[PDB]
Design a protein around this motif. Structure first.
Motif, PDB file in Angstrom:
ATOM      1  N   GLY A  30     -13.100 -16.707  26.268  1.00 57.44           N
ATOM      2  CA  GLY A  30     -12.140 -17.742  26.595  1.00 57.44           C
ATOM      3  C   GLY A  30     -11.233 -18.055  25.435  1.00 57.44           C
ATOM      4  N   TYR A  31      -9.955 -18.184  25.651  1.00 58.49           N
ATOM      5  CA  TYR A  31      -9.007 -18.556  24.608  1.00 58.49           C
ATOM      6  C   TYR A  31      -8.193 -19.789  24.965  1.00 58.49           C
ATOM      7  CZ  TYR A  31      -5.211 -16.437  27.367  1.00 58.49           C
ATOM      8  OH  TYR A  31      -4.305 -16.131  28.352  1.00 58.49           O
ATOM      9  N   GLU A  32      -7.624 -20.402  23.928  1.00 54.59           N
ATOM     10  CA  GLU A  32      -6.590 -21.413  24.127  1.00 54.59           C
ATOM     11  C   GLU A  32      -5.616 -21.366  22.942  1.00 54.59           C
ATOM     12  OE1 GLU A  32      -7.774 -25.432  25.084  1.00 54.59           O
ATOM     13  OE2 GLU A  32      -5.620 -26.099  25.102  1.00 54.59           O
ATOM     14  N   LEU A  33      -4.304 -21.387  23.238  1.00 58.82           N
ATOM     15  CA  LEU A  33      -3.252 -21.703  22.258  1.00 58.82           C
ATOM     16  C   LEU A  33      -2.706 -23.059  22.635  1.00 58.82           C
ATOM     17  CD1 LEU A  33      -1.156 -21.115  20.024  1.00 58.82           C
ATOM     18  CD2 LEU A  33       0.202 -19.978  21.743  1.00 58.82           C
ATOM     19  N   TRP A  34      -2.547 -23.942  21.647  1.00 61.98           N
ATOM     20  CA  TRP A  34      -1.891 -25.238  21.900  1.00 61.98           C
ATOM     21  C   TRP A  34      -1.108 -25.576  20.657  1.00 61.98           C
ATOM     22  CZ3 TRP A  34      -1.288 -30.034  19.741  1.00 61.98           C
ATOM     23  CH2 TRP A  34      -0.746 -31.026  20.570  1.00 61.98           C
ATOM     24  N   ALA A  35       0.096 -26.076  20.826  1.00 64.69           N
ATOM     25  CA  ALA A  35       0.880 -26.618  19.710  1.00 64.69           C
ATOM     26  C   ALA A  35       1.787 -27.696  20.223  1.00 64.69           C
ATOM     27  CB  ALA A  35       1.714 -25.522  19.045  1.00 64.69           C
ATOM     28  N   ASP A  36       2.132 -28.646  19.371  1.00 58.62           N
ATOM     29  CA  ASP A  36       3.049 -29.723  19.800  1.00 58.62           C
ATOM     30  C   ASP A  36       4.520 -29.295  19.810  1.00 58.62           C
ATOM     31  OD1 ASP A  36       3.358 -29.713  16.957  1.00 58.62           O
ATOM     32  OD2 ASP A  36       3.196 -31.864  16.787  1.00 58.62           O
ATOM     33  N   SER A  37       4.853 -28.266  19.028  1.00 55.55           N
ATOM     34  CA  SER A  37       6.255 -27.942  18.642  1.00 55.55           C
ATOM     35  C   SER A  37       6.233 -26.645  17.850  1.00 55.55           C
ATOM     36  CB  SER A  37       6.880 -29.065  17.755  1.00 55.55           C
ATOM     37  OG  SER A  37       6.199 -29.240  16.502  1.00 55.55           O
ATOM     38  N   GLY A  38       7.388 -26.023  17.705  1.00 54.61           N
ATOM     39  CA  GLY A  38       7.574 -24.843  16.879  1.00 54.61           C
ATOM     40  C   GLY A  38       7.662 -23.547  17.661  1.00 54.61           C
ATOM     41  N   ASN A  39       7.829 -22.463  16.927  1.00 54.81           N
ATOM     42  CA  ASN A  39       7.922 -21.120  17.463  1.00 54.81           C
ATOM     43  C   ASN A  39       6.631 -20.394  17.085  1.00 54.81           C
ATOM     44  OD1 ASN A  39       8.778 -18.527  18.244  1.00 54.81           O
ATOM     45  ND2 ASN A  39      10.186 -18.275  16.505  1.00 54.81           N
ATOM     46  N   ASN A  40       5.688 -20.403  18.032  1.00 53.63           N
ATOM     47  CA  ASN A  40       4.285 -20.092  17.758  1.00 53.63           C
ATOM     48  C   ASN A  40       3.745 -19.024  18.668  1.00 53.63           C
ATOM     49  OD1 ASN A  40       4.247 -22.484  15.975  1.00 53.63           O
ATOM     50  ND2 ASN A  40       4.134 -23.681  17.868  1.00 53.63           N
ATOM     51  N   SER A  41       2.659 -18.390  18.267  1.00 53.10           N
ATOM     52  CA  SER A  41       2.034 -17.406  19.131  1.00 53.10           C
ATOM     53  C   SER A  41       0.601 -17.210  18.714  1.00 53.10           C
ATOM     54  CB  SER A  41       2.754 -16.062  19.086  1.00 53.10           C
ATOM     55  OG  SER A  41       2.517 -15.393  17.861  1.00 53.10           O
ATOM     56  N   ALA A  42      -0.159 -16.560  19.583  1.00 48.71           N
ATOM     57  CA  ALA A  42      -1.498 -16.096  19.199  1.00 48.71           C
ATOM     58  C   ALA A  42      -1.788 -14.843  19.992  1.00 48.71           C
ATOM     59  CB  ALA A  42      -2.587 -17.131  19.488  1.00 48.71           C
ATOM     60  N   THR A  43      -2.525 -13.904  19.409  1.00 51.04           N
ATOM     61  CA  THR A  43      -2.929 -12.671  20.087  1.00 51.04           C
ATOM     62  C   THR A  43      -4.443 -12.713  20.134  1.00 51.04           C
ATOM     63  OG1 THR A  43      -0.984 -11.512  19.296  1.00 51.04           O
ATOM     64  CG2 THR A  43      -2.797 -10.126  20.033  1.00 51.04           C
ATOM     65  N   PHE A  44      -5.004 -12.699  21.336  1.00 51.07           N
ATOM     66  CA  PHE A  44      -6.440 -12.803  21.546  1.00 51.07           C
ATOM     67  C   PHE A  44      -6.943 -11.456  22.038  1.00 51.07           C
ATOM     68  CE2 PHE A  44      -4.812 -17.150  22.256  1.00 51.07           C
ATOM     69  CZ  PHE A  44      -5.563 -17.837  21.306  1.00 51.07           C
ATOM     70  N   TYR A  45      -8.063 -11.012  21.489  1.00 48.42           N
ATOM     71  CA  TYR A  45      -8.670  -9.713  21.829  1.00 48.42           C
ATOM     72  C   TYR A  45      -9.971  -9.905  22.583  1.00 48.42           C
ATOM     73  CZ  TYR A  45      -5.404  -7.794  18.418  1.00 48.42           C
ATOM     74  OH  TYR A  45      -4.273  -7.444  17.693  1.00 48.42           O
ATOM     75  N   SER A  46     -10.316  -8.917  23.417  1.00 45.38           N
ATOM     76  CA  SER A  46     -11.563  -9.001  24.166  1.00 45.38           C
ATOM     77  C   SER A  46     -12.840  -8.879  23.330  1.00 45.38           C
ATOM     78  CB  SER A  46     -11.574  -7.973  25.301  1.00 45.38           C
ATOM     79  OG  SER A  46     -11.493  -6.692  24.761  1.00 45.38           O
ATOM     80  N   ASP A  47     -12.728  -8.399  22.075  1.00 48.86           N
ATOM     81  CA  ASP A  47     -13.891  -8.426  21.188  1.00 48.86           C
ATOM     82  C   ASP A  47     -14.109  -9.815  20.560  1.00 48.86           C
ATOM     83  OD1 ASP A  47     -11.997  -8.590  19.157  1.00 48.86           O
ATOM     84  OD2 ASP A  47     -12.637  -6.770  18.116  1.00 48.86           O
ATOM     85  N   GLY A  48     -13.286 -10.812  20.912  1.00 46.80           N
ATOM     86  CA  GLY A  48     -13.448 -12.160  20.346  1.00 46.80           C
ATOM     87  C   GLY A  48     -12.474 -12.496  19.252  1.00 46.80           C
ATOM     88  N   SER A  49     -12.012 -11.454  18.559  1.00 48.27           N
ATOM     89  CA  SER A  49     -11.137 -11.637  17.396  1.00 48.27           C
ATOM     90  C   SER A  49      -9.760 -12.047  17.856  1.00 48.27           C
ATOM     91  CB  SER A  49     -11.123 -10.306  16.600  1.00 48.27           C
ATOM     92  OG  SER A  49     -10.390  -9.275  17.231  1.00 48.27           O
ATOM     93  N   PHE A  50      -8.941 -12.533  16.925  1.00 48.67           N
ATOM     94  CA  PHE A  50      -7.640 -13.050  17.293  1.00 48.67           C
ATOM     95  C   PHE A  50      -6.786 -13.209  16.059  1.00 48.67           C
ATOM     96  CE2 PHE A  50     -10.405 -16.781  16.914  1.00 48.67           C
ATOM     97  CZ  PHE A  50      -9.622 -17.812  16.427  1.00 48.67           C
TER      98      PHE A  50
END
Length: 227
Positions: A30-50
């Motif tokens: 399970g993943y979550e990205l949350w931010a209040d503001s900005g130009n943001n990203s996250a890359t989540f992998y099925s091995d858990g890493s990110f």
């Protein structure tokens, strides 16, 4: 001395890149990205890493790990651990940060943090809670334990909830957090867990004045029920 994943960790498995606020699953994590503001990203992998990127953010959270249905306490679920390797990369104007494990319970509604590192120049301080329980040996290391009451967004909507913190005294960038060992210590101090909603590896960066930017890599991150 260290575990083998500290030497040999690398991103593998299927991945998803998100740039908006999103909760989801990638493979069986399970993943979550949350931010209040900005130009943001996250890359989540099925091995858990990110991996995480934030630019001009006030508060940015990237996290991956377990999501539960809030029917069972931690002791009913089983003993839980999180393996992680954090690689700090460039950052600027990071006023506060938590890296480690984060999650929630219900009945009581509690947000909890086991903080082993930070992307800010200094660890979070006494400002994290109104009750400073002091220093404790937890999971083979010294942690400062705090408790707080917070009003704001939560998994139930905008309300009030308790917060529990363990803040490591000496930063760790690779190892295993014995999550349940923190739950055990907290219970001795009158900080009870409700029914578990999540337990995830977290990288959070923020600045109360805005403008936090940077990237952080988690080439290993895996939360599991075991040992």
């Amino acid at each position: 001395e260290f575990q083998s994943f500290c030497s040999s960790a690398s991103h593998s498995g299927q991945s998803v890149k998100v740039t908006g606020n999103k909760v989801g699953t990638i493979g069986g994590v399970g993943y979550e990205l949350w931010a209040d503001s900005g130009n943001n990203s996250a890359t989540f992998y099925s091995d858990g890493s990110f991996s995480c990127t934030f630019q001009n953010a006030g508060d940015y959270l990237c996290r991956s790990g377990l999501s539960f249905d809030s029917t069972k306490t931690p002791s009913q679920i089983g003993r839980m651990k999180a393996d992680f390797k954090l690689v700090k990369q460039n950052s600027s104007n990071v006023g506060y940060s938590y890296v480690g494990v984060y999650g929630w319970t219900r009945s009581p509604l509690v947000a909890y943090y086991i903080v082993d590192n930070w992307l800010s120049p200094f660890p979070p301080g006494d400002w994290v809670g109104n009750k400073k329980h002091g220093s404790f040996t937890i999971d083979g290391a010294q942690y400062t334990v705090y408790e707080n009451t917070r009003t704001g967004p939560s998994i139930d909507g905008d309300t009030t909830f308790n917060q529990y913190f363990s803040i490591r005294q000496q930063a760790r960038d690779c190892g295993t957090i014995d999550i349940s060992a923190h739950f055990d210590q907290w219970e001795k101090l009158g900080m009870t867990m409700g029914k578990l909603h999540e337990a995830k590896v977290l990288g959070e960066a923020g600045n109360v004045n805005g403008g936090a930017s940077g990237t952080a890599d988690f080439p290993y991150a895996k939360v599991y029920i075991g040992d």
